[PDB]
Structure 1
């Protein structure tokens, strides 16, 4: 029916976006991937040698293996009724650093040190984050003028 081919539904997603064709920027290769670095997968279209599949494009995994030109990444794949820890070799052009934990890594760094500021100063700063609370009972001011009377416009085509 449906031609179960590798690289099948990627008429658009294995393409360079627009006016970013040509040869690749070189700081793509001067990235440092250690074990446990959380990386996400976005397969390009210029390098043919190590593009993953159309199931990992847009997903995020974690580096378990580092070699000369590629990186082993352990991702989760939704197959029918269970998800599977799967491990793929992907060349280094197709990935980047996930910034999803990098806004967690600030608030473990500036949270551990602000904890020990309350031990020298003596308070209960409550360093845990809260959601957006309901708005405070504030006070609006119509100083000078009076409010504007608006009304719905008539219908004209």
Structure 2
């Protein structure tokens, strides 16, 4: 059977990208994580302290505790037929703010603003994101040039 080591099969997952080894850029250290941010997990092999287990690599969780160097986050893990929301502590290098939430936040601010506006105007405005509707009817103008014929080319071997 296999081995139950903590880092089995991570030679590519925890490795560094090509031509990106060396000193960790300081912007990663200079970011602020508060209680309740949605955050992504991406193990970085450069630092070995507080490295998350390989099964949380690429997972997104919620911050619930902030500490000197690390952050505690609640993340869902599918174990057999059930999902457990378990909390793990990850050092700040292996973490990154999720941009999936800021889009929704900006949308909230923007449609709240356009709801506050036009409230006095009384006009109607659409807020829900409708799915891509079918294309409407239109005209395709030929400019006096007729469409050119397309025919299959004859078979002839290359190799």
Q: TM-score, normalised by structure 1?
A: 0.98
Q: CA deviation at 1:134?
A: 0.3
Contiguous gaps of at least 5 residues in structure 1: none
CA distance in 1: counterparts of 2:140 and 2:105, whole angstroms:
39
CA distance in 2: counterparts of 1:3 and 1:67, whole angstroms:
33
CA distance in 1: counterparts of 2:121 and 2:9, whole angstroms:
60
Contiguous gaps of at least 5 residues in structure 2: none
CA distance in 1: counterparts of 2:67 and 2:116, whole angstroms:
41
Match of 1:29 in 2: 29
Q: How many residues align?
A: 157
> Residue deviations 1:65-99, cap 9 Å, x none?
00000000000001001000110000000000000
CA distance in 1: counterparts of 2:154 and 2:80, whole angstroms:
55
Q: Where in structure 1 do 4 or more consecutive aligned residues deviate above 3 Å?
A: none
Q: TM-score, normalised by structure 2?
A: 0.97
Q: CA deviation at 1:40?
A: 0.6
> Residue deviations 1:24-44, cap 9 Å, x none?
000000000000010010000
CA distance in 2: counterparts of 1:122 and 1:148, whole angstroms:
53
Match of 1:19 in 2: 19
Q: CA deviation at 1:127?
A: 1.3
